[PDB]
Amino acid sequence: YRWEKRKMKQLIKARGYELKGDHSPISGIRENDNSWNDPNPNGYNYAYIRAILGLAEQYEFQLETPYQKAIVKIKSANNCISRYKSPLLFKIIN
RNA sequence: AUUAAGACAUUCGUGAGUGAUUUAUUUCCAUGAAGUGGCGU
């Protein structure tokens, strides 16, 4: 799986919107795979990876063109999942 | 003219006197002002 952030950036670049960044979106794990296009045979497998560690409402992408930014809104695609508490609990004792 | 004639079962008289619709009863039980970060790789 590749996180939805990768395809969010790719879709926005597919339109006449250019995003701020010196490095291309990261693909895979290797040290330098900053690529904009999927490998070759077919597109990567994508999923909403960041949901399992806490559901958000908006994704802000902050276009390079100043004083304007792109907002991606997350909705449950049928009103079933409105929130999700993070499943990790941090504890501080002594 | 005949064991007959006359004669209101009537007068007076408060359904009234005493009496608390009162006693007992928790508008209470359950419920996180919470959830999430995003981009600048």
Question: What is the experimental resolution, given in Å to one decimal place?
Answer: 2.8
**Residue–nucleotide distance: A61 CA to B6 C1' (Å):** 136
Strand residues in chain A grouped as ranges (E) = 2-3, 46-47, 58-60, 71-73
Token digits of residue A15: 């339109």
How far, in Å, CA of A50 to CA of A66, rounded? 27
**3-state secondary structure string across A3-72:** EHHHHHHHHHHHCCCCECCCCCCECCCCCCCECCCCCCCCCCCEECHHHCCCCCCEEECCECCCCCCCEE
Provide the CA A32 to C1' B15 distance, Å, integer: 116
Residue closest to B40 C1′ by Cα: A21
Contact A61/A72 with Cβ under 8 angstroms? yes
DSSP, res A45: P
Residue A41 CA distance to nucleotide B35 C1' (Å):
40
For A19, the 3-state DSSP assignment is: strand
